[PDB]
Short mmCIF file of N, CA, C and O in Angstrom, two decimals:
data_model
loop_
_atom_site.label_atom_id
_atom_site.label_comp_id
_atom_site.label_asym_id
_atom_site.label_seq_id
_atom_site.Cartn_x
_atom_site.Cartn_y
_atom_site.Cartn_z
N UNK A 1 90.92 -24.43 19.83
CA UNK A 1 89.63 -24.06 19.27
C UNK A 1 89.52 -22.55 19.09
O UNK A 1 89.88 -21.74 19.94
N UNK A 2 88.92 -22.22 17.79
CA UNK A 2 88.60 -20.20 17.83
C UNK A 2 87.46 -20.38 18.70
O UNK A 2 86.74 -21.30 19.11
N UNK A 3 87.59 -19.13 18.81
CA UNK A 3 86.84 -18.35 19.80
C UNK A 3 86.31 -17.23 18.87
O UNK A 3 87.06 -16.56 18.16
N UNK A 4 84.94 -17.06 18.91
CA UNK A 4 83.85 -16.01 18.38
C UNK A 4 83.28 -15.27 19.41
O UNK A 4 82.08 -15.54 19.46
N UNK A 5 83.69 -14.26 20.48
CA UNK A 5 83.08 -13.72 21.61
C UNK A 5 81.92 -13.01 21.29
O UNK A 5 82.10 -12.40 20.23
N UNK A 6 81.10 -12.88 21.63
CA UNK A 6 79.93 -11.67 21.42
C UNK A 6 79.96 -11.30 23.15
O UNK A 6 80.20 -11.85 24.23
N UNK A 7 79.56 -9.97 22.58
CA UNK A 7 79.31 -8.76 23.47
C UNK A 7 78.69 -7.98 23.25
O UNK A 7 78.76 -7.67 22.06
N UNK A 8 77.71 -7.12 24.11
CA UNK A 8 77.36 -6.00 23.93
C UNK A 8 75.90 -5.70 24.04
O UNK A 8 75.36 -4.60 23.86
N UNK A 9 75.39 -6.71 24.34
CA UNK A 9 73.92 -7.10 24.38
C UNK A 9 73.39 -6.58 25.73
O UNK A 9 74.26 -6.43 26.59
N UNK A 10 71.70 -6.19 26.20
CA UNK A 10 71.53 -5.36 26.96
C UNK A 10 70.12 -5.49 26.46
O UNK A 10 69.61 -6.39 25.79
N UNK A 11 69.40 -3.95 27.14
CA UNK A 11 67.64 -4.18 27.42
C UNK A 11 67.70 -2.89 26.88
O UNK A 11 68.41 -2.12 27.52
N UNK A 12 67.13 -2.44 25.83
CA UNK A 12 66.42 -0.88 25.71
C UNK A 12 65.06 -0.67 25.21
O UNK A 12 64.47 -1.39 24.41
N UNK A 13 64.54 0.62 25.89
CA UNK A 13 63.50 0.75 24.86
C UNK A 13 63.77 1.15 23.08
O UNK A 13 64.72 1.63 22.45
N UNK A 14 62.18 0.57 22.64
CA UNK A 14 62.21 1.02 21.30
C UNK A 14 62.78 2.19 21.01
O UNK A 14 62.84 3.01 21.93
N UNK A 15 63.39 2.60 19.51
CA UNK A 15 64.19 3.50 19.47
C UNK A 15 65.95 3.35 19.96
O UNK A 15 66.90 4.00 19.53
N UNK A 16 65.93 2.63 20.63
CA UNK A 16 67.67 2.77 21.40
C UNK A 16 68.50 2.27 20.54
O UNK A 16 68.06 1.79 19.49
N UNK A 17 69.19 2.28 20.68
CA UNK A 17 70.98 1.76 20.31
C UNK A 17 71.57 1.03 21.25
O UNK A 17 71.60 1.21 22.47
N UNK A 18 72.30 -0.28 20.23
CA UNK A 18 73.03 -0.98 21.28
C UNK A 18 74.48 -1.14 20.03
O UNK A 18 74.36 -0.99 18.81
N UNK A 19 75.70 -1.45 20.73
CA UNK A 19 76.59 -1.93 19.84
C UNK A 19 77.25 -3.18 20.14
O UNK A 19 77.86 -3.24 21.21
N UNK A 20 77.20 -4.33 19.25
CA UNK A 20 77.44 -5.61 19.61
C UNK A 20 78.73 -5.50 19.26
O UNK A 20 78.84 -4.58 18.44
N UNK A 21 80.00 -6.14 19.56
CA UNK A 21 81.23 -6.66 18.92
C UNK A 21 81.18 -8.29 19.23
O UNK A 21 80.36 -8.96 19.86
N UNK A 22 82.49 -8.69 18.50
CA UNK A 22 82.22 -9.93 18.00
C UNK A 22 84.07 -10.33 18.24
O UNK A 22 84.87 -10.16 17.32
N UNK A 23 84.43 -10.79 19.41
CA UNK A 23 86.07 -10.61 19.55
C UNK A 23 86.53 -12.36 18.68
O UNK A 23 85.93 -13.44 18.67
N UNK A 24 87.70 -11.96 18.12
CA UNK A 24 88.24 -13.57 17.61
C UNK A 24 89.46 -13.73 18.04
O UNK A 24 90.26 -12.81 17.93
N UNK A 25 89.73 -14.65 18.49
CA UNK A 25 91.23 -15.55 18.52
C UNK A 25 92.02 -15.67 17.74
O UNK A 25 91.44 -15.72 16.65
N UNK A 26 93.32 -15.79 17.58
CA UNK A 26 94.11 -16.04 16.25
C UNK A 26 94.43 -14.94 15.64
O UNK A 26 94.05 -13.84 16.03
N UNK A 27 95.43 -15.20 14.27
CA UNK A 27 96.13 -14.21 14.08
C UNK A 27 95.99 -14.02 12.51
O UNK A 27 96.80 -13.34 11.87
N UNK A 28 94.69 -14.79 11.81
CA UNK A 28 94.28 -14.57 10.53
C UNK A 28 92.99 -13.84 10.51
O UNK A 28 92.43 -13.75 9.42
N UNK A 29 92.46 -13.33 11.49
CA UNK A 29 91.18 -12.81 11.34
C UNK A 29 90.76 -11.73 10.52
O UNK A 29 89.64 -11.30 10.79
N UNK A 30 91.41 -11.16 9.54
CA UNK A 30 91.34 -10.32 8.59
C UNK A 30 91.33 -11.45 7.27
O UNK A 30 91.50 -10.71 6.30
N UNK A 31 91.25 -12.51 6.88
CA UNK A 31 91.33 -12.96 6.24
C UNK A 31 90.02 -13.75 5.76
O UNK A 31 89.90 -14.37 4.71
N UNK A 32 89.08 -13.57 6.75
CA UNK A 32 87.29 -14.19 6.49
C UNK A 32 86.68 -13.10 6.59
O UNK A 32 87.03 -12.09 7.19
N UNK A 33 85.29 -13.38 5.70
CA UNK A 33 84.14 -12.99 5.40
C UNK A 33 83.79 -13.15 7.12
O UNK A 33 84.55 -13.75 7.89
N UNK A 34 82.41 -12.44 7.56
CA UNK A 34 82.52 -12.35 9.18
C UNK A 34 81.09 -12.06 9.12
O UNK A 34 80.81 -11.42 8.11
N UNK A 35 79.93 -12.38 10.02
CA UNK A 35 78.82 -12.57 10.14
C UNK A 35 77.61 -12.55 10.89
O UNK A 35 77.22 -13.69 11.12
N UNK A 36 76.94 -11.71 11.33
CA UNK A 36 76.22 -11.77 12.58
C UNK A 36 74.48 -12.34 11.87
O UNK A 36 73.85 -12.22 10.81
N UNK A 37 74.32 -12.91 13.08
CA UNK A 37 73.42 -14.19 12.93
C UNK A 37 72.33 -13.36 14.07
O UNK A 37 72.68 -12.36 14.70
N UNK A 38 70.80 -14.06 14.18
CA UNK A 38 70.41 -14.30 15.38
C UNK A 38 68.88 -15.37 15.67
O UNK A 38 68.15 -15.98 14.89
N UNK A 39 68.88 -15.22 16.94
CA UNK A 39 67.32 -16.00 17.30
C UNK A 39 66.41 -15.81 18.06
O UNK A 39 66.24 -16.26 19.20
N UNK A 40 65.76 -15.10 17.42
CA UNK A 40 64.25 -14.80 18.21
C UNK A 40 63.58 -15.87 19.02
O UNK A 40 63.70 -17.01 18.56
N UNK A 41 63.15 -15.79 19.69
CA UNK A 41 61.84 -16.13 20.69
C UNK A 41 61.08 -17.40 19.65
O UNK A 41 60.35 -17.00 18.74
N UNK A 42 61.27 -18.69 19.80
CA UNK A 42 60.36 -19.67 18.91
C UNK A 42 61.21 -19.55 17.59
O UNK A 42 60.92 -20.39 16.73
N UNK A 43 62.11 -18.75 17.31
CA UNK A 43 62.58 -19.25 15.71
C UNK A 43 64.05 -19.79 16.06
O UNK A 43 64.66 -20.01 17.10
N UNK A 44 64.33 -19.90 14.68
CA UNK A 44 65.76 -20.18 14.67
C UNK A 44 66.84 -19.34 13.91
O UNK A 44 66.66 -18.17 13.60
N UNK A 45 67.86 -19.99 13.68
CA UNK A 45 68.74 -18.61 13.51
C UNK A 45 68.91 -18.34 12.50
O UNK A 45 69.16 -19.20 11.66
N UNK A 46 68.81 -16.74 12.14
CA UNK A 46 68.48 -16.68 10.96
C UNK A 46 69.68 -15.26 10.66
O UNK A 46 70.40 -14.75 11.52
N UNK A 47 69.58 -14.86 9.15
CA UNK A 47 71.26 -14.20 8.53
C UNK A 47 70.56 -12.68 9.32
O UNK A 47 69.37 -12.66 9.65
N UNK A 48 71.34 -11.70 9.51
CA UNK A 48 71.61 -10.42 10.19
C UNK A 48 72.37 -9.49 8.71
O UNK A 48 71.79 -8.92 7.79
N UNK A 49 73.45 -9.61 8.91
CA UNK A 49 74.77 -9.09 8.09
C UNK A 49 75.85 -9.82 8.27
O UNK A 49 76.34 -10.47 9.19
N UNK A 50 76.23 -9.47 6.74
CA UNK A 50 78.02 -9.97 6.73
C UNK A 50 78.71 -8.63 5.93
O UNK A 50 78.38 -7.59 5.35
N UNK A 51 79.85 -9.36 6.30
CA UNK A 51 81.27 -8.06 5.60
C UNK A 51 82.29 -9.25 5.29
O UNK A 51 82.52 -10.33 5.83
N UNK A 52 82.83 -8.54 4.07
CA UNK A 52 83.79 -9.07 3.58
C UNK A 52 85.40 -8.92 4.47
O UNK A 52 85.60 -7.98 5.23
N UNK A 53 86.38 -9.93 4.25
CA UNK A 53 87.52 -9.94 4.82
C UNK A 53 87.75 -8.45 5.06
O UNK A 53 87.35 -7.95 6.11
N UNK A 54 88.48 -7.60 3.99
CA UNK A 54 88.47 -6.42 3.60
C UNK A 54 88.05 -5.07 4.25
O UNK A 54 88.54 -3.94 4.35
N UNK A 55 86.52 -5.93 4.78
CA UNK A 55 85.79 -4.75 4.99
C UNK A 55 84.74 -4.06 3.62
O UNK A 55 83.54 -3.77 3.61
N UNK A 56 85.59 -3.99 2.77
CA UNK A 56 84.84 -3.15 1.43
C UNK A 56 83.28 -3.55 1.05
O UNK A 56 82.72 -2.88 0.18
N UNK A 57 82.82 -4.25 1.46
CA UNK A 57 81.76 -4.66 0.93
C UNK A 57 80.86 -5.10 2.14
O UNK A 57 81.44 -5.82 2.95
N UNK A 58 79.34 -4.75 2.45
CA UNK A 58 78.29 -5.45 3.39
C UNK A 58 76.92 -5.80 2.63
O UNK A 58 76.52 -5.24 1.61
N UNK A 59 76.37 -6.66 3.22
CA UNK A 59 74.89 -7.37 3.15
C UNK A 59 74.44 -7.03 4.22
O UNK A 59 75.15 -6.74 5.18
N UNK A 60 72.84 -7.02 4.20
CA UNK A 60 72.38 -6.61 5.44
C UNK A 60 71.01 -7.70 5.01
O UNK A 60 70.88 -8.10 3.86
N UNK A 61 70.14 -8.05 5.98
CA UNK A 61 68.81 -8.72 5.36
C UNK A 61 67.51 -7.16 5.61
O UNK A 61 67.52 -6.03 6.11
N UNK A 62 66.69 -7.94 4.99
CA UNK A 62 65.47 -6.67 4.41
C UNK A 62 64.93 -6.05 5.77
O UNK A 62 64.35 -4.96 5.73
N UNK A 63 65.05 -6.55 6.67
CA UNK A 63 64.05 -6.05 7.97
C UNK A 63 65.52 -4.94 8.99
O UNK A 63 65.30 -4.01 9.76
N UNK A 64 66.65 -5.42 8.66
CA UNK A 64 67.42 -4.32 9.43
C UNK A 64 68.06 -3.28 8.52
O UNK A 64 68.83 -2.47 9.04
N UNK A 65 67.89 -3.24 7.50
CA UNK A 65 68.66 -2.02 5.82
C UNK A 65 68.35 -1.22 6.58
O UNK A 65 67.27 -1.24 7.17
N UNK A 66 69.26 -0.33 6.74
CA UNK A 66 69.30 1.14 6.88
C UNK A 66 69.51 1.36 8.60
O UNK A 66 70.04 2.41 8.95
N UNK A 67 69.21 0.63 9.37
CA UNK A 67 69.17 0.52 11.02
C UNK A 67 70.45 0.15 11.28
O UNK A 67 71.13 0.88 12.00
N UNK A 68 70.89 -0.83 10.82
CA UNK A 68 72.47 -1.45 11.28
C UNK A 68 73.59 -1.53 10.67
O UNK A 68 73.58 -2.23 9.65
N UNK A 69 74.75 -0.96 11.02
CA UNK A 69 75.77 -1.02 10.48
C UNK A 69 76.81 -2.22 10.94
O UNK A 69 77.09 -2.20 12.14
N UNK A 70 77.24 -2.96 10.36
CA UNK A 70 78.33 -3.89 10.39
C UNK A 70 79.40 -3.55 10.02
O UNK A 70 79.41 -2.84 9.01
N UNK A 71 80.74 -3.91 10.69
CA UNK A 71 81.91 -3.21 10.37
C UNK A 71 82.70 -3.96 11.26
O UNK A 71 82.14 -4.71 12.06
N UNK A 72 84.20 -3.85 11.21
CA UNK A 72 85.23 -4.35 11.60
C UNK A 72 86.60 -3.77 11.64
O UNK A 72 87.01 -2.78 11.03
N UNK A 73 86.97 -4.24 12.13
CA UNK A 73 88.11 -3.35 12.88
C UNK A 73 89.52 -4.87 12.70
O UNK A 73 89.54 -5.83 13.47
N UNK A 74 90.25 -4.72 11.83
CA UNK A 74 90.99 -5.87 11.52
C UNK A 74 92.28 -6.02 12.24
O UNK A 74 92.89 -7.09 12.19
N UNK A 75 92.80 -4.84 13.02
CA UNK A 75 94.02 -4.89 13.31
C UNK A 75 93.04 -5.10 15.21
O UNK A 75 93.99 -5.54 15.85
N UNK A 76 92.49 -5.07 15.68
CA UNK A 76 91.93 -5.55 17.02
C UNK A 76 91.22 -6.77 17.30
O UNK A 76 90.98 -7.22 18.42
N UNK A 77 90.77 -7.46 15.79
CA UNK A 77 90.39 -8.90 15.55
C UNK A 77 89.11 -8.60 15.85
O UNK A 77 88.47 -9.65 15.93
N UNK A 78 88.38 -7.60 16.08
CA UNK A 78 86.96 -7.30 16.12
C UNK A 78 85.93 -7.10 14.93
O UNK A 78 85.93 -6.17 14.13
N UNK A 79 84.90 -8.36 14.98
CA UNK A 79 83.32 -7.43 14.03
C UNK A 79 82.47 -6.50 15.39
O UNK A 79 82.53 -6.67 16.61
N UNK A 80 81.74 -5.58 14.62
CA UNK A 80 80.47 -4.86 15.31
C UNK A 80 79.44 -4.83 14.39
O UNK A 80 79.47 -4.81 13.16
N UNK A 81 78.58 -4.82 15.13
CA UNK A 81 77.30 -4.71 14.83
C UNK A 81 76.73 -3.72 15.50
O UNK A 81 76.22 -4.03 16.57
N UNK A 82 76.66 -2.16 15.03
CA UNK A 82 75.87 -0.90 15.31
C UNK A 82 74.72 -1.07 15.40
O UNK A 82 74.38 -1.55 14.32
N UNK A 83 73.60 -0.94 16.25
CA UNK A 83 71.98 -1.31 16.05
C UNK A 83 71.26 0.17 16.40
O UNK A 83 71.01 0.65 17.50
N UNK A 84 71.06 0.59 15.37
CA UNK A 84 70.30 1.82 15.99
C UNK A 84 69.08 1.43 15.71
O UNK A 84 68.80 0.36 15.17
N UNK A 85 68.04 2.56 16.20
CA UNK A 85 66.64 2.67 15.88
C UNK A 85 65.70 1.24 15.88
O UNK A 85 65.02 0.79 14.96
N UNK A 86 65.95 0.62 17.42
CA UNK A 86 65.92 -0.62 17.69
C UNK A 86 63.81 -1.31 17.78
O UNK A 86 62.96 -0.64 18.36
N UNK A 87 63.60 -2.27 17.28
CA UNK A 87 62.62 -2.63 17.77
C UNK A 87 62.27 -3.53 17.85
O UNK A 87 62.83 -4.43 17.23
N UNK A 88 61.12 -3.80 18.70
CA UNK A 88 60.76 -5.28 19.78
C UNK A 88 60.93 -6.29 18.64
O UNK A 88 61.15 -7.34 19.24
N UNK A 89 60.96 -6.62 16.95
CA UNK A 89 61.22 -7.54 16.53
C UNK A 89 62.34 -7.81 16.45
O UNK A 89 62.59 -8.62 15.56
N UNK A 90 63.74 -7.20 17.43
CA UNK A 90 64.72 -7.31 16.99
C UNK A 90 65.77 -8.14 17.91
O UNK A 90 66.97 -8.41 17.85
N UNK A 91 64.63 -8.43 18.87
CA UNK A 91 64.72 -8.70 20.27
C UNK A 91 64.97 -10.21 20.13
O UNK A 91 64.00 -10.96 20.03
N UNK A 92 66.18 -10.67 20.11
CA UNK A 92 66.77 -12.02 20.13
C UNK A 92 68.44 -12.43 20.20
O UNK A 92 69.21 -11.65 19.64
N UNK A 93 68.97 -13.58 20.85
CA UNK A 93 70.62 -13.99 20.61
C UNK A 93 71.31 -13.51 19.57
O UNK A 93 71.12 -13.94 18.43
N UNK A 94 71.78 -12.99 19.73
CA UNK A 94 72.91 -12.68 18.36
C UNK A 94 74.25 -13.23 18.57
O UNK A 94 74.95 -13.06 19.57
N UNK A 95 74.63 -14.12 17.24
CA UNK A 95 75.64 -14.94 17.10
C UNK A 95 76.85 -14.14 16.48
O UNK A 95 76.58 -12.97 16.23
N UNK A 96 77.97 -14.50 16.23
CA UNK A 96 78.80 -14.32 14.74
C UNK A 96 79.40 -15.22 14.62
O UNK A 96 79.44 -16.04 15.54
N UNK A 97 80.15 -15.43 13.40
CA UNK A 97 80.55 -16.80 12.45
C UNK A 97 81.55 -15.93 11.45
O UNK A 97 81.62 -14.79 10.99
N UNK A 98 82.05 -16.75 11.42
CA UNK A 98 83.20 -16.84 10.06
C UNK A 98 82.45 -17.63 8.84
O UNK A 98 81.55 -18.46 8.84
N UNK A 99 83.28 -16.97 7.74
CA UNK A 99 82.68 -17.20 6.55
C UNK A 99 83.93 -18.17 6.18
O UNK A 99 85.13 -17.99 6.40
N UNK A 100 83.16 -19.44 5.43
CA UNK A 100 84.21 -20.22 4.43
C UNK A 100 83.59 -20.53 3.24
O UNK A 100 82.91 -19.68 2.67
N UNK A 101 83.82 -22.17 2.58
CA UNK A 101 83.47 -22.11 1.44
C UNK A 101 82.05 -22.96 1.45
O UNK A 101 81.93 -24.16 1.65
N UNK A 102 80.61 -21.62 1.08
CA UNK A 102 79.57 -21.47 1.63
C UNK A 102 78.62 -22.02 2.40
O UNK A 102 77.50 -22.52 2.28
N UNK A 103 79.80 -21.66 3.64
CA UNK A 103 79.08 -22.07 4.89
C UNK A 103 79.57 -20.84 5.85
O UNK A 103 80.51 -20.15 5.46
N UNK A 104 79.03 -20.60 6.91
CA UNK A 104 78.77 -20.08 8.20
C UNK A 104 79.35 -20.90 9.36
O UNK A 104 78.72 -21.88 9.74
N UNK A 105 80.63 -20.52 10.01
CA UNK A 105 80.65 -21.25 10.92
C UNK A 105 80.87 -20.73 12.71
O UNK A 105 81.60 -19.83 13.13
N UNK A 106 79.93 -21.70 13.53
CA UNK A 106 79.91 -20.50 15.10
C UNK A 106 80.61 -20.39 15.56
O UNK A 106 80.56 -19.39 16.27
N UNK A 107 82.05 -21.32 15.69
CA UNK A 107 82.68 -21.65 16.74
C UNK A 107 82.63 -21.37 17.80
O UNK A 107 81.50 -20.92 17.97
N UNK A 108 83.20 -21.34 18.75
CA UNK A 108 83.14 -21.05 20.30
C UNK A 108 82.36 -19.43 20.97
O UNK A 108 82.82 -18.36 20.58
N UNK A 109 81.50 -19.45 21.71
CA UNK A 109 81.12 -18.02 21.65
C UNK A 109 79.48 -18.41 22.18
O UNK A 109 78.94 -19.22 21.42
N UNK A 110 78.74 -18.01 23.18
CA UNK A 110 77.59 -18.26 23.49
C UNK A 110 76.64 -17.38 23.46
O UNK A 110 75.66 -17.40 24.20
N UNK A 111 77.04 -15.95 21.92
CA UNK A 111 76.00 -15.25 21.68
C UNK A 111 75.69 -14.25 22.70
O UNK A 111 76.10 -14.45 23.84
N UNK A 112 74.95 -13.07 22.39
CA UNK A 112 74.39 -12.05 23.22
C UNK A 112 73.15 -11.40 23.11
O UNK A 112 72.62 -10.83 22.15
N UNK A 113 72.65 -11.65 24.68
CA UNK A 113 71.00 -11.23 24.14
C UNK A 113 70.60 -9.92 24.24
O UNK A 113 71.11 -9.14 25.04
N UNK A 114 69.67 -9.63 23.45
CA UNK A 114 69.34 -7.83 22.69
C UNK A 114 67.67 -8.35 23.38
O UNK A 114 67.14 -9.38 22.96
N UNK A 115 67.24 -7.76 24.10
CA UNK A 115 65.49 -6.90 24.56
C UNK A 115 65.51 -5.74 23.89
O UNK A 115 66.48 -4.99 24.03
N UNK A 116 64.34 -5.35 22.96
CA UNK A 116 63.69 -4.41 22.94
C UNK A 116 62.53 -4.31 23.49
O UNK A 116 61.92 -5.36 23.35
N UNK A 117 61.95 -3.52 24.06
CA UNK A 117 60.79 -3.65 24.61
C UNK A 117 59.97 -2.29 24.86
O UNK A 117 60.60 -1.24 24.74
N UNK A 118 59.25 -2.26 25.05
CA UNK A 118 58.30 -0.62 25.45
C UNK A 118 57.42 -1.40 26.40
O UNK A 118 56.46 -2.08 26.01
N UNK A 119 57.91 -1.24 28.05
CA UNK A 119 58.21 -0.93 29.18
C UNK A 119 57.48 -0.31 29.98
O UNK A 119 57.03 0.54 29.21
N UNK A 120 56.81 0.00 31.41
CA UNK A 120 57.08 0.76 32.13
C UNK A 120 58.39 1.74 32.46
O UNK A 120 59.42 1.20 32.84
N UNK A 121 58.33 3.14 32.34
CA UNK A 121 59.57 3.71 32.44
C UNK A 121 59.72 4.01 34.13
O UNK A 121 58.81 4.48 34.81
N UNK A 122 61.20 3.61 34.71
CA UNK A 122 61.29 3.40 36.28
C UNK A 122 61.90 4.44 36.66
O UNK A 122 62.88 3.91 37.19
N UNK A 123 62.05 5.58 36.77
CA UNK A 123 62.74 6.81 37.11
C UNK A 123 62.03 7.63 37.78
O UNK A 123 62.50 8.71 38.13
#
């Protein structure tokens, strides 16, 4: 079975940065479209960004443009997902998936959860 690892998930306040990666199994992983997904609190899962095999090309959806960068790293079998300038709507599981013929698929991988929040600060 592949394996889709996510990582990188954590608690910050609004404003922060987190960086997700997305580890795969196997020895074609430069060869799919690649995808980060997620799920808020009461919804379901809904598109983030994708990148092409390549790399050359990204989508982003309307509520993260300009905040997140997606990218990949083909010779380490890694996607990332850069999240800057983070906020409390952003605060949910994040998946990734491989791209085929148009579909999304999760395989193995149990996602990573992202808090944004504005907090009591404990210091």
């Amino acid at each position: 079975q592949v394996q889709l690892q996510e990582s990188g998930g954590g608690l910050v306040q609004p404003g922060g940065s987190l960086r997700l990666s997305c580890a795969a199994s196997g020895r074609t992983f430069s060869s799919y479209n690649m995808g980060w997904f997620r799920q808020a609190p009461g919804k379901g899962r809904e598109f983030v960004a994708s990148i092409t095999s390549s790399g050359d090309k990204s989508d982003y959806t309307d509520s993260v443009k300009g905040r997140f960068t997606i990218s990949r790293d083909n010779a380490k079998n890694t996607m990332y997902l850069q999240m800057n300038n983070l906020k409390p709507e952003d605060t949910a599981t994040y998946y990734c998936a491989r791209g085929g013929g148009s579909v999304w698929i999760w395989y193995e991988g149990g996602g990573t959860q992202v808090t944004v929040s504005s907090h009591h600060h404990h210091h």
